[model samples]
Target: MAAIPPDSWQPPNVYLETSMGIIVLELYWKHAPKTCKNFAELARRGYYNGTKFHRIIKDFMIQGGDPTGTGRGGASIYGKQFEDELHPDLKFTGAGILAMANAGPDTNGSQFFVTLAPTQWLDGKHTIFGRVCQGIGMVNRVGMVETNSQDRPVDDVKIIKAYPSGGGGSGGGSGGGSGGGSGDGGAFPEIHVAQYPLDMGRK
Candidate 1:
């Protein structure tokens, strides 16, 4: 729809190179300014270089980006917190969604999570940042990882590199090759959401 991205929007494309394949993600800077800015800056600055997905929930979501690779551990810069502005129309579904992990509201910093499936129950609870444009299967593989009691992956699922798609990540709300409606099998929307813990009852 919109060709030109807003000033508040800084479209940053994220490339997640997992064991499976490459996942391309585009951040929405207009809606979540502080969160998106911090995320984009971190990627550009190479903050998530060695980080891995610490938490995994099958058919739910996969979470990572903490330096410690443990759910308890904070981001590379744990204190790097941001604000939480929830959008009611947004839903958590699909292969890729960027979300922040915090103890409570406004505690977001370097820690984030990506959704492998739609998680509608997390609405208005966490600070969402962006979503993945490609590599939905990679997210699924990452989410299927095995972890210890602390939810730290025994085998690290790292995001190799992250950047913008086609010069700017196309933040005009029309980039990232987004499709209409949620995917099949109880999916929601491709959105970046705040991360927490969700057990699929397999543990």
Candidate 2:
């Protein structure tokens, strides 16, 4: 595997607190660097708690990470925007590619989407930060639910909670990056800022 600078990598550990068991996500910090750090920091700071999974697609993917629930909107009291860090070689293999959801090029912030099928077309364009090392079923179920405008789920698959996926603080897969390469994380795999979901389109 080819390699790149490891300056921005910060092992990611996220937990999707759901009605079922927790869906753990180990981010690919080595591949997406800045994007992973931003997501980790946001989760650690509790920025996704009431935000709902506004966008859902049965076959393509399930998107959410917007507090407004409009698939947009995020700004901590601290005011920040994670720098754009997308590698040209990244690709979505199956149901484990976790990438940033952005309004436009390099506009990712507090929003993301996951793949249930092969969405390799997204490679290199969207920031590939993590992969669904576990919970392909739950996340896939999220896409199975009904949705509304902008693909927003009609029933609200809320990200009620998020946190580090494992204990021992392993930081989850720190090394093992053989040949000092920048290969993508074992393929894994969003958010909000309000007390409730927002209706940006006035829906």
Candidate 3:
């Protein structure tokens, strides 16, 4: 019943715990190094805790990272807005694409969104720094929530906590990451599995 021990879910890889469910995100650390570094640092500093998704569009996307839940109030870890680390290979070809939510060119910040469909037009517009390696359905569940005129979720569909996986959280209850091992461990192929020492002999 046991498999190849699964992939590494640490650093660069993060568990985005939300009110809906946990979304395992594999940041495009190699392709979008600057963006990933900035975002991952924010995660480590508890910058996204208790933040609401703020905006949701079914079959479109769900945006968050704005501590104000207003979609217009979040700033980058740098205090001032940072420039986009736009890599050509990092694309928005499908659902669960994590990208910076910007107003115009070079206006990247703490705000981010997950696409529900192929947003080809956004390829050059926003900085795609990460993707949902697991729990894409959680993105859907969050996107599918009922919203008011402002695209805000009627209920509390928000981020519980987000952190780089090797070590994180407010320091209690394991913060509930890969421990369950019951969700989509092998469902998505987007996350390239790196061989770990534990599975060397079992394979």
lDDT per residue (tens digit) for residues 66-123 in model 2: 8865444584532555455656344444454566787666666777777655566766
lDDT of 1 by residue, 147-180 (tens): 6459655565666765544332232335664644
Clashing pairs in 3: none
> Where does candidate 2 stray beyond 4 Å?
1-11, 19-21, 77-83, 147-154, 167-203
Residue pairs with colliding backbones in model 1 are 13-163, 13-164, 80-109, 93-118, 93-189, 98-130, 98-192, 99-193
Return the TM-score for candidate 2, rounded to 2 decimals.
Answer: 0.66
What is residue 74's positional error in candidate 2, in angstroms?
Answer: 1.2
**Best candidate (score: lDDT):** 3
Instruction: State the C-alpha lDDT per candidate.
Output: 0.56, 0.57, 0.62
On a 0 to 100 scale, what is the lDDT of residue 26 in model 1?
56
**How well does each candidate superpose onto the true structure, as a TM-score?**
0.64, 0.66, 0.69
Ordered from best to worst lDDT, the candidate numbers read: 3, 2, 1
Candidate 3 lDDT over 1-203, as tens digits, reads 42122233338777778877887776666767666666666677777786777768776667777786554445544666666655546444446667777766676767778777656767787776666655766676567668645975468666797877842223233766644433342122144332211121122
Which model scores highest in TM-score? 3
Stretches of model 1 off by over 4 angstroms after superposition: 1-11, 69-80, 93-95, 145-154, 163-203
lDDT of 2 at 108: 61
